Amino acid sequence: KTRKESYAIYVYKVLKQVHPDTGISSKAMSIMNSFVNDVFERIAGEASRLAHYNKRSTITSREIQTAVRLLLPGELAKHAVSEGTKAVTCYTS
Amino acid sequence: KTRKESYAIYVYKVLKQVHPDTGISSKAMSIMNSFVNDVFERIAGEASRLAHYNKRSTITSREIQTAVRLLLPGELAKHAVSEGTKAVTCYTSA
Amino acid sequence: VLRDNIQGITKPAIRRLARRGGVKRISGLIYEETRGVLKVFLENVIRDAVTYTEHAKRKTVTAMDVVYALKRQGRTLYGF
Amino acid sequence: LRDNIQGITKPAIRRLARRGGVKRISGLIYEETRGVLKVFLENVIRDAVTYTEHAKRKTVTAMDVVYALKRQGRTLYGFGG
Amino acid sequence: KTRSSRAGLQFPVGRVHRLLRKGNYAERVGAGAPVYLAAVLEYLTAEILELAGNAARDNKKTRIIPRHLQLAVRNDEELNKLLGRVTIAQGGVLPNIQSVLLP
Amino acid sequence: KAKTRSSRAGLQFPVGRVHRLLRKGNYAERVGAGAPVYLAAVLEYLTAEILELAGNAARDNKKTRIIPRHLQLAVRNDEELNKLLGRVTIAQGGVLPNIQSVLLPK
């Protein structure tokens, strides 16, 4: 019929790690999808502006780090930047 | 030295046709310049967002009109869209 | 056409809204005031909704148009 | 540089409040106001310093403050915006 | 070997790279930007789903409904700032009564 | 001979400049050929509409140089230019004279 992509299955895979026996309904999955979209758009927009300021064109893993430091609040920023640098380290090898 | 740009001379050419005898200061010129930049960014960003929802791949003279009609308040919108369409007509037929 | 449909927002409805918000004793003149406020809010949102619809050459106000109209005002909405 | 917030003295707060339009100040405002101003300044200089150390330099420019302001909803015209 | 598994993630690094490229953000998307961004998004959705499940458990249910996401977010102190302006649908209000009102 | 693109439309603001900014600002993959003209028309309309009130203020104040205070007056005294600039702060613009009525003596 009509193909529309969403973050439902990944949200489900994460739920099955944080709580191995609970299950999201349909409305709550729609809400989590909208939340992921919103946060993605915030971080991407801030990284774009932050690259435009220093007169560059590559949006590399430094701009995303600085944008996470700007957007996310005090504590979430630390754990988010930690998870990010850990993942890029475990990916570049 | 490296040459940076602004809207100084154009704001001045407009001042010298709205008030043919007044003259702008320096800080007021920088304020008008940053105002023009800010409104430029607002309008172009909304126009982009609008030319994205519709899956178009271009930002045409109608995305700009709808952006101007969303951002600008009640009556500024009508005069702004009139000046815009007049300029675009006078430009295309030349 | 329709007319004077704002009166459908009854007194018990506003009362229940206030009770959810935490109120305990509502005055008498409130109902008209909140009717006016709600009408203003709805006008401001539906204006942008209809603009977003017109731009796409459609005649049905989608749900994403209402979501975008709300987001453009700093009031996002999760679930549509 | 320790305990400089006392530099926002009482007459300065009086003048700000006069320009604000108030007529009869209380006596306790002059500490709530310093607290508010310190919170605002921290919230702005944090993003200013982030913007200035992302660009690999050690000088807080005026564009950095303009950006850190515009990002919180409060733009500012006149300083190269 | 998908590029997400190579990082030890659950979010689609490929799809995030595609979105960053095709969203008109910058001229040339880097290499380790989608990995970082997918990791951040995964961390955030885990941090919110954990409290959502907790809230749904205390209410003796096994399904997470918007009431539980509302509770999880608004009860936290740093997610309530991130989602400071959103209005989760079917969410309701956090129960609270001003002390002056109750007898 | 050449003929500036912003002179074929009766505008003062540059159209080639606005077009280059739209192109190299990463707003979309393609820019219509009449979008910069429309946008430059709107920009010069707004700047003329504010400079006119600024000059009116600077004249009704017996000066002959527009100065930040005059722009602050021209904006905050209007009603629609006030919503377009409800969040901005105009450096060195002061504030608008206003005193509540409960405070004025009786």
Place this chain on the structure above:
Amino acid sequence: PHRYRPGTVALREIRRYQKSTELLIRKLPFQRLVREIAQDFKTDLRFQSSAVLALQEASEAYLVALFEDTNLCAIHAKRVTILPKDIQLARRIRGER
């Protein structure tokens, strides 16, 4: 015979409504209102079903929130009732007017 003291059913309703998530305004009159407010901007408007509800949901989270502030203003004046000069302050402080 028996009569709850004036004002004690208020808190019962408060706890009953703050705990649920239903929609407080009747759905059909709100659909009519939203459908006739848009008659000033176009005429052949259709209002896809899940749009109206969308609006309605938002249009509750506004009013509730507004009352959460109105109460504060009332409590500021050493009061209990929320008279219509509270809504106006609560809307002028947040810049909505």
Place this chain on the structure above:
Amino acid sequence: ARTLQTARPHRYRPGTVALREIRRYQKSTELLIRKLPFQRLVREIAQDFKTDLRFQSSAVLALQEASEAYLVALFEDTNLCAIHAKRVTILPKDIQLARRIRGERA
């Protein structure tokens, strides 16, 4: 008939010098905080983020502008709260209510 033309000890009660300072400040447009104390305050606050920054001389000034245009505006709102409670003084429970309603505390 003639040619028309345009031209041809003490102790103020409490509350009057205030209504005069209000009128003389709501019309001026200078900065109402000393510059060296604000310099030092900005430099001292930026220690908690990075040790030795250099604070280009237009940065500091910039901050000052905003730091006024915030506080002043805040006071306006608090004023109303005071007038709302049927009084004339502004109290710390007014600033807190303004900041709560306005969104800065929640």
Place this chain on the structure above:
DNA sequence: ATCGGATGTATATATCTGACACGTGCCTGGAGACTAGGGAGTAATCCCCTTGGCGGTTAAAACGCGGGGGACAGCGCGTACGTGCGTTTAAGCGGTGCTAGAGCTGTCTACGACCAATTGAGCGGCCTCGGCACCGGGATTCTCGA
């Protein structure tokens, strides 16, 4: 405070569906490999402008005090708001019908990116004088005590 009861709410068993969770094909978005090229990293260097220090001066801050206006507490009056009961009314729900208009696909072409040669607009550096800030001395208004 003490009961007595009367209303409301919370607990637990039965049951009943419909929405969530899982397995299936299958289509295209993602992964691998390789190349070319320009964007970013790195070394040199230069000069701007930030920091630091110092002396004078004088504007602004700090302190203390007298008292009058304002905040706050305490009472009576009365009305307008809540609670309960008996009415009306239209919301909601189910079921039918139907037609407007969203949505998707193929064909064609007008339009914007790209590239080359060029040339004049505007940008940086130089004067320079008129608008504006400053000072002084009138008139002119406003507040307050009598």
